[PDB]
Ligand binder design. Structure first.
Ligand code: CLR
Ligand code: OLC
Ligand code: 7LD
Length: 393
């Protein structure tokens, strides 16, 4: 048809590209460099947890370095693909790869924190350097597999002109099941681990309270004991609970000030000595020793119990909120991407416009994610402050 009023010539969108550089691309590249430099040279930050965390910082750095800048060309020159043709499947592949790896890294981290709560007795038996490298490798294999349909299939190609996009027609299956594997599955897992963590912390605080009153009750049992035999087992009941309460937390392998967990080492040592008296038969002498156990209880143990529960609870809450924001900002993209495949009434043209926008809410979500996470750690936070002032020694 002929419509001369159809002056639908796309205006210049350079100001949006400049704003994504300033507000998204630079914070992504800068923020993940800091996290990488920190784990790299700051010798006090080099352990298993961070090597996995560094891997995440790498994935997010690669997003802002190879995915995000070429995504600007989607914006500057709206119609066509400026780069060579083989760069199109390469770019799309790197996009799905690095974006998926970031989401799955957080899923794994969540599981580790829950495991660290449930079973703190995992000192280099696992959660070591070998364990670190295995889960790093797996996450990448998962994200490689999810991303690999894109280059294997490719974008259809006559003129050597291509439009770099995943259409509903050609990648409908991938747009649907590729989102489930990359987002909604690690989302479901993180929802499950969330409630499991609440149960773990409540069950842990409960057990500690039981250990506490076990110590105190048996103290009165000892103090009010006329017989010898009931002193001996009242002491061994204390010894079991003390070890029980101590084992609800890793050793101080970890740390510059007081270590309340050491109180259990002292307490048990006193119990054993008092238990030697009970065996010899010196009951009156043993009861006096048991009264001295209270000094250890008042000094170390009482503060330890509130220390453990409060600290584990706190670290749990903040980790949940930051991981919640990550997922929440990735929500508008993947929900839209799904409805693009499952809704046939919606205008695909404008439903694609929302995709091209929501992807930047996700990009900045992945990009600044390790920074926001590491900033609640003092060693990282102090390291950053020295880096931004260009100080290395
Ligand atoms: C065209 C666009 C993408 C420019 C990219 C921005 C890059 C080149 C610039 C902008 C801000 C810069 C960062 C600013 C802060 C620091 C602290 C310094 O101790 C280490 C390098 C680091 C992390 C810089 C690395 C390079 C950096 C990320
Ligand atoms: C109704 C259920 C819907 C939302 C509630 C669940 C909120 C899920 C928030 C997930 C945040 C998260 O990743 O938690 C991991 C956990 O903290 C690791 O220790
Ligand atoms: C606006 C257009 N772009 C960029 C070219 C996308 O829609 C990208 C397509 C993706 C995508 C499609 C289909 C399945 C998937 N799993 C994981 C991703 C994914 C990542 C996801 N990236 C982040 C955006």
């Amino acid at each position: 048809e002929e419509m001369k009023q159809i002056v639908e010539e796309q205006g210049n969108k350079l100001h949006w590209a400049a704003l994504l550089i300033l507000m998204v691309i630079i914070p992504t590249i800068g923020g993940n460099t800091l996290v990488i430099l920190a784990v790299s040279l700051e010798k006090k930050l080099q352990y298993a947890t961070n090597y996995f965390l560094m891997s995440l910082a790498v994935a997010d750095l690669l997003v802002g370095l190879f995915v995000m800048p070429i995504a600007l060309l989607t914006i500057m020159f709206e119609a066509m693909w400026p780069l060579p043709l083989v760069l199109c499947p390469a770019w799309l592949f790197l996009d799905v790869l690095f974006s998926t790896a970031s989401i799955w890294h957080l899923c794994a981290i969540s599981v580790d924190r829950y495991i660290a709560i449930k079973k703190p007795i995992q000192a280099n038996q696992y959660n070591s350097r070998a364990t670190a490298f295995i889960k790093i490798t797996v996450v990448w294999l998962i994200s490689i597999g999810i991303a690999i349909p894109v280059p294997i299939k490719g974008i259809e190609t006559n003129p050597n002109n291509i439009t770099c996009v995943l259409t509903k027609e050609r990648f409908g299956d991938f747009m649907l099941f590729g989102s489930l594997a990359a987002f909604f599955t690690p989302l479901a897992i993180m929802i499950v681990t969330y409630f499991l963590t609440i149960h773990a912390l409540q069950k842990k605080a409960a057990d500690l309270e039981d250990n506490w009153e076990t110590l105190n009750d048996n103290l009165k049992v000892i103090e009010k004991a006329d017989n010898a035999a009931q002193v001996k087992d009242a002491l061994t009941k204390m010894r079991a609970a003390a070890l029980d309460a101590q084992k609800a937390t890793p050793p101080k392998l970890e740390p510059e000030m007081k270590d309340f967990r050491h109180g259990f080492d002292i307490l048990v040592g006193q119990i054993d000595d008092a238990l030697k008296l009970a065996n010899e038969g010196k009951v009156k002498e043993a009861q006096a020793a048991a009264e001295q156990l209270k000094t250890t209880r008042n000094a170390y143990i009482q503060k330890y119990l509130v220390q453990t529960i409060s600290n584990e609870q706190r670290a749990s809450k903040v980790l949940g909120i930051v991981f919640f924001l990550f997922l929440l900002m990735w929500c508008p993209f993947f929900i839209t991407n799904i409805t693009l495949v499952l809704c046939d009434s919606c205008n695909q043209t404008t439903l694609q416009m929302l995709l091209e926008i929501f992807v930047w809410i996700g990009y900045v979500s992945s990009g600044v994610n390790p920074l926001v996470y590491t900033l609640f750690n003092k060693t990282f936070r102090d390291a950053f402050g020295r880096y931004i002032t260009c100080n290395y020694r």
